[PDB]
Design a protein around this ligand. Structure first.
Ligand code: AWZ
Length: 455
């Protein structure tokens, strides 16, 4: 074959090897890559024949699961440095025009996407950014000039990046605690509507901050979780803290009648979450009512009105049969919404545990890229809900109060959840032990203002 001899030799260039079942596999137009060696992945990422924006996006989202950022940069620079063949210039003019120029453009296309959509890599590693500017500095040619500028214009935008409502939002609601009196802020003293509004604004912001790479390769459960998954972990910790705070509010209210009022208020909070389509919020309340300390409180739930029970039961049924009702509800509503985040983590963990890192062919390891695309498709679903701002006014004091929630204190999670359950046994002992009475802890009126706003 003359076309293969037009390409460089194997002893001078590693990205012009023949394709086979020993180095690359395609899935069942543009071929979609099932698996392959890292060399073949870089080859197809910068393929001369066509543009592959789907593969570029998916590669750059997921590559950290099989290749370090330092390795990737080296490999795309090695790819870029295509050696010219020796002289006998008709062959050299075709080779430059039809192979070198396309591949070199495709490498810079990868660099542009890398810096525009995954600049955080270059924030985490300073030397990585120096190398990229070193490489983008030392270039040539008329066609590259535009790409070399566009890349360096994006880099300086991200250096600078380091350092309004459409309609009229509704009036902020208050109840017992007056505006400013932050010492009196609590579950029953703030207004339930406003608790729900401020948590939704907070959770919306945390949902939108999560980047796809934070979820790939289960990196949030590894040694470098705090650097690789800062927004993700912030979102999980909020959910952990809000859930355990609801549970703490209920079981530390030892008086039965006061505890009924606490539980009823949390169900009211959930009602406003569903008015707002904050599903994350709905399912935090559901998680709290189903926890071991709360779910067993039969005396408490006996006094909760039937309509409130029904609402809480209907919320639970969102999760039944692999979240069927939830998923039908989510696709049917209009913006704005906060999707339930927990399901995405569950399904990514099933993809990660359920598929192998590599595929065996003839004793050689090919990286399983279909595994990465599946994970990226799940992060794609996350992204489609990330541009949905709420027409709701921030209240900084209430925001700050829920931002600084720390129900566990200085306790570990297990010992705190053991405490909560032991507290549940104290306030409502198991049969046949009699139910003791406990004195009231609240000096203020327990009647809720309700969930209809003003006007
Ligand atoms: C399959 O088991 C469950 C079935 C469940 N079915 C339904 C319809 N809703 C569940 N959860 C919601 C969030 C509820 C929590 C508390 C609720 C309640 C209302 N009245 C009483 N309770 C418990 C003591 C007496 S309802 C389920 C939770 C389940 O596991 C925790």
């Amino acid at each position: 074959a003359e076309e293969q001899m037009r390409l460089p030799s194997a002893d001078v260039y590693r990205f012009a090897e023949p394709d086979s079942e020993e180095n690359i596999i395609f899935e069942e137009g543009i071929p979609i890559i099932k698996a392959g060696t890292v060399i073949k992945l870089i080859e197809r990422l910068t393929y001369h024949m066509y543009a592959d924006p789907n593969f570029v996006r998916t590669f750059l989202t997921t590559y950290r699961s099989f290749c370090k950022p330092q390795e990737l940069l080296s490999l795309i620079i090695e790819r870029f440095e295509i050696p010219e063949p020796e002289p006998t210039s008709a062959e050299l003019k075709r080779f430059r025009k039809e192979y070198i120029q396309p591949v070199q453009l495709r490498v810079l296309n990868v660099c542009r996407h890398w810096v525009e959509h995954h600049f955080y890599d270059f924030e985490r590693d300073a030397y990585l950014l120096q190398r990229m500017e070193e490489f983008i500095g030392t270039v040539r040619g008329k066609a590259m000039k535009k790409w070399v500028e566009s890349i360096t214009k994006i880099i300086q935008r991200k250096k600078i990046a380091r350092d309004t409502f459409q309609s009229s939002p509704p009036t902020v609601e208050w109840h017992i605690s007056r505006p400013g009196h932050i010492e009196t802020f609590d579950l029953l003293t703030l207004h339930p509507i406003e608790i729900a509004r401020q948590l939704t604004l907070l959770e919306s912001d945390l949902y939108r901050a999560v980047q796809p790479s934070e979820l790939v390769g289960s990196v949030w459960t590894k040694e470098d979780k705090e650097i690789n998954s800062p927004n993700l972990l912030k979102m999980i910790r909020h959910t952990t803290n809000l859930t355990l705070w609801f549970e703490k509010c209920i079981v530390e209210t030892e008086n039965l009648e006061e505890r009924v009022a606490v539980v009823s208020r949390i169900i009211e909070i959930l009602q406003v979450f569903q008015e707002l389509n904050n599903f994350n919020g709905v399912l935090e309340v559901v998680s709290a009512m189903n926890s071991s300390p709360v779910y067993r409180l039969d005396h408490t739930f006996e006094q909760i009105p039937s309509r409130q029970k029904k609402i809480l039961e209907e919320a639970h049924e969102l999760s039944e049969d692999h979240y069927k009702k939830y998923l039908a509800k989510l696709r049917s509503i209009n913006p704005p919404c906060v999707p339930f985040f927990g399901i995405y983590l569950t399904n990514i963990l099933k993809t990660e545990e359920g598929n192998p890192e590599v595929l065996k062919r003839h004793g050689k390891e090919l990286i399983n890229f279909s595994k990465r695309r599946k994970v990226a498709e799940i992060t794609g679903e996350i992204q489609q809900y990330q541009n949905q701002p709420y027409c709701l006014r921030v209240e900084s004091d209430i925001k700050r109060f829920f931002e600084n929630l720390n129900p566990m204190g200085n306790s570990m999670e297990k010992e705190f959840t053991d405490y909560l359950f032991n507290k549940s046994l104290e306030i409502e002992p198991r049969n046949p032990k009699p139910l003791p009475r406990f004195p009231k802890k609240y000096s203020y009126p327990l009647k809720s203002p309700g969930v209809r706003p003003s006007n």
